[PDB]
């Protein structure tokens, strides 16, 4: 009817139709608007706040209080209209047309009989509108009349838009009143999600456990820093409810992945078998065994779909009959009896049968962690699954097999890492803090310091860890701490402050952590680094909240901090540690603990004492014995096969042939390096020169064995 009503949209009609039904109470914020609308002078509040905190939902909640009458009667009966710029700026084609568009809008808003309070979505867009070459801005037209009280206006801008666009025109600011929308303070956000449950249960049809509602608050808010609180806490339930519809209306996820893969592996059988028999025989026979055994995993998977399908329907059968007969039979409680025989016969099974079916689900969720089949209930494991996917942990490691791989870590580490078993328990237990969820918030997991003499495998514990915890080399965010010899190289960590070159990118270390928040961070050599770099990390060990060029908080929760550094080259004794390590004694136990107590005292001198207490476990690696180095050399030959997979030359070695490799180049003062130099510069040459001259066909197995007579190594070729 009215001239502004076709511009934008009428917000009041959508409350009447129920599109905008309901808001949670932010009543101190809501009444502050109503008082600003009743002022004598300006009557134009602006909802300044963070982008996610629901600034429009106050106004979407304010219209619901107008039509339902929860306002004073001086504001009773006004209608609220939004103004999108998609409809507002369409008439700016001709030169004197947009001002006529502006003129009739003012002529309706100045009317008192026309009871309209106006709303705009973002005011900072409205400043740059209608700027023809002969015409003024739309905001400058409003400036003489927004000072006058008859034009009621409500608007909302974010803080970064308000400091850049409104403050550039300071005269446009004084027509408006700030009302600060505040972040909703997590303990109130739990009550917001509980208010919204019935709206999601109608749109999704999926039961939502209150366990997930707290998990949608504490896990969303404290662990993610951008996109302020209710844009996080509502978002995961928005993904939790969307996650289960696809597993119910479609198949569950495990069957969906395996059916696609077997169709792809069968396509690879068509590629390899048609080719000539060669080196690809080994991969073809690998894939045929992979094809059958994954296909046989299906037969128990469908069994699980049917059995949990029987568990789901049998719980669904009692929710239709006895759950409704429990509730509707509330009539005539007063005198026509509410507790006689048969009224409770069925109420008795409603605790027996329903809770037994409940415990079969809960035991199935902890067994099949995130991919439980035929489950109508949201759980914490579903909320953590979405958190773990969008945060960026790789798809096949340590969390998707929840609470099962944390026990197997210490067994798996030993093969990769034989020696120094005491420190590996601390690395295993730090992941046990991570996998259970029990840890200190805003404290990084596992701030280990790895002291020792060179070549005892201090960084090996870390290289193999990213392969083990994450199955990805890229998650090892190594930084070369030996680069930071200069005092002025500190800005490689946090980045360059504003007004200097390279501000648009952040710090080179911190830009990777935003990309990979679940990562095992290295610091290669704190021995050879300037003390000013230690001032900046000091932050990262006590808190995760290191700051950037833009002061964005970074999540160093769920980040294992391995710090290898030396502090040796004297002080670790040449005759009481290196040469005497072979003779297994309890005399180890007053010499290793003796030299360790000086090393923590050494950290008080070269590092700061603030590192001595914030580091969780200062591991000191024992120098290598013969029995450990006998298996470290055995590892190399296991790694030598990986370099020779492209040429299909399997390499094996006898234990007597390992010992001659040890006896020729055993130096504990270095440890594990000259043995590898003796492997890679001597034994590896005839692995090499016997290929150039044709002593090695591409399918030849090698078994190195010490002669123990003729004194020279023999090379067994088949």
């Amino acid at each position: 009817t009215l001239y502004i009503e076709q511009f934008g949209s009428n917000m009041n009609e959508k409350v009447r139709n129920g599109k905008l039904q309901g808001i949670y109470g932010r009543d101190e914020e809501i009444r502050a608007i109503i008082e600003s609308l009743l002022r004598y002078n300006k009557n134009s509040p602006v909802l300044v706040g963070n982008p996610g905190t629901g600034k429009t939902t106050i106004v979407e909640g304010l219209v619901y209080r107008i039509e339902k009458g929860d306002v004073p009667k001086e504001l009773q009966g006004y209608t609220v209209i939004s103004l999108n710029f998609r409809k507002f700026t369409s008439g700016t084609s001709y030169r004197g047309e947009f001002e006529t568009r502006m003129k009739n809008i003012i002529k309706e808003l100045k009317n008192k009989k026309n009871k309209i309070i106006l709303f705009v979505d973002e005011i900072h867009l409205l400043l740059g509108a209608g700027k023809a070459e002969g015409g003024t801005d739309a905001a400058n037209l409003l400036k003489p009349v927004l000072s006058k009280g008859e034009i009621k206006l409500i608007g909302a801008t974010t803080i970064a838009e308000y400091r850049k666009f409104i403050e550039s025109c300071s005269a446009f600011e004084r027509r408006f009143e700030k009302i600060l929308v505040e972040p909703p303070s997590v303990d109130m956000t739990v009550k917001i999600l509980r208010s919204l449950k019935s709206k999601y249960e109608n749109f999704y049809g999926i039961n939502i456990t209150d366990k997930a509602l707290v998990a949608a608050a504490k896990i969303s808010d404290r662990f993610i820093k951008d996109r302020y609180l209710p844009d996080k806490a509502i978002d995961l339930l928005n993904k939790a409810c969307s996650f289960l519809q696809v597993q119910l209306s479609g198949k569950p996820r495990i069957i969906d992945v395996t059916e696609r893969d077997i169709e792809r592996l069968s396509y690879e059988i068509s590629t390899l078998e048609k080719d000539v028999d060669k080196v690809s025989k080994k991969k073809y026979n690998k894939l045929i065994k992979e094809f059958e055994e994954k296909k046989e995993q299906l037969k128990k998977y469908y069994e699980e779909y049917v059995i949990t399908g029987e568990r789901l329907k049998r719980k669904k059968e009692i929710e239709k009959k006895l759950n409704d007969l429990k509730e509707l039979t509330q009539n005539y409680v007063y005198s026509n009896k509410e507790p006689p025989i048969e009224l409770q016969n069925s109420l008795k099974e409603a605790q027996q049968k329903y809770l037994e079916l409940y415990k079969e689900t809960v035991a199935y969720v902890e067994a099949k962690t995130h991919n439980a089949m035929n489950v109508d209930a949201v759980y914490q494991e579903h909320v953590s699954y979405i958190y773990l996917r969008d945060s960026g942990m790789p798809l096949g490691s340590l969390s998707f097999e929840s609470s099962k791989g944390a026990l197997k870590l210490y067994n798996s580490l030993s093969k990769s890492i034989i020696g120094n078993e005491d420190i590996i328990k601390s690395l295993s237990d730090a992941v046990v803090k991570a996998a259970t969820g029990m840890k200190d918030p805003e404290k990084p997991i596992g701030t280990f310091l790895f002291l020792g003499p060179t070549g005892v495998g201090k960084t090996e514990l870390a290289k193999t860890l990213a392969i083990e915890l994450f199955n990805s080399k890229d998650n090892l965010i190594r930084v070369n701490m030996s680069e930071f010899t200069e005092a002025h190289s500190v800005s490689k960590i946090t980045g360059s402050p504003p007004g200097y070159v390279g501000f648009s990118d952040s710090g080179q270390l911190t830009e990777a952590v935003r990309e990979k928040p679940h990562s095992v961070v290295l610091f290669d050599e704190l021995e050879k680094a300037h003390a000013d770099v230690f001032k900046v990390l000091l932050q990262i060990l006590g808190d995760g909240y290191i700051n950037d060029n833009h002061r964005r908080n970074i999540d160093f929760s769920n980040t294992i901090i391995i710090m290898t550094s030396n502090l040796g080259a004297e002080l670790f004794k040449k005759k009481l540690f290196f040469d005497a390590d072979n003779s297994g004694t309890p005399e180890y136990k007053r010499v290793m603990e003796d030299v360790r107590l000086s090393l923590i005292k050494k950290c008080k001198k070269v590092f700061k004492p603030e590192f001595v207490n914030r580091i969780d476990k200062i591991g000191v690696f024992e120098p290598l014995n013969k029995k450990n180095l006998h298996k470290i050399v055995a590892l190399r030959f296991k790694k030598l096969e990986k370099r020779l997979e492209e040429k299909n030359i399997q390499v094996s070695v006898s234990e007597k042939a390992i010992d001659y490799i040890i006896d020729q180049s055993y130096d504990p003062e270095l440890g594990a390096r000259p043995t590898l130099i003796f492997i890679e510069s001597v034994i590896m040459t005839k692995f090499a020169i016997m290929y150039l001259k044709k002593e090695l066909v591409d399918d030849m197995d090698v078994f190195v064995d010490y002669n123990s007579k003729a004194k020279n190594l023999v090379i067994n070729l088949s």
């Binding site: 002593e695 003729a710 020279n712 190594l713 023999v714 090379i715 067994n716 070729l717 088949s718």
Partner: peptide, 5 residues
């Protein structure tokens, strides 16, 4: 001792 055996 290269032995092809």
């Amino acid at each position: 001792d290269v032995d092809s055996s």
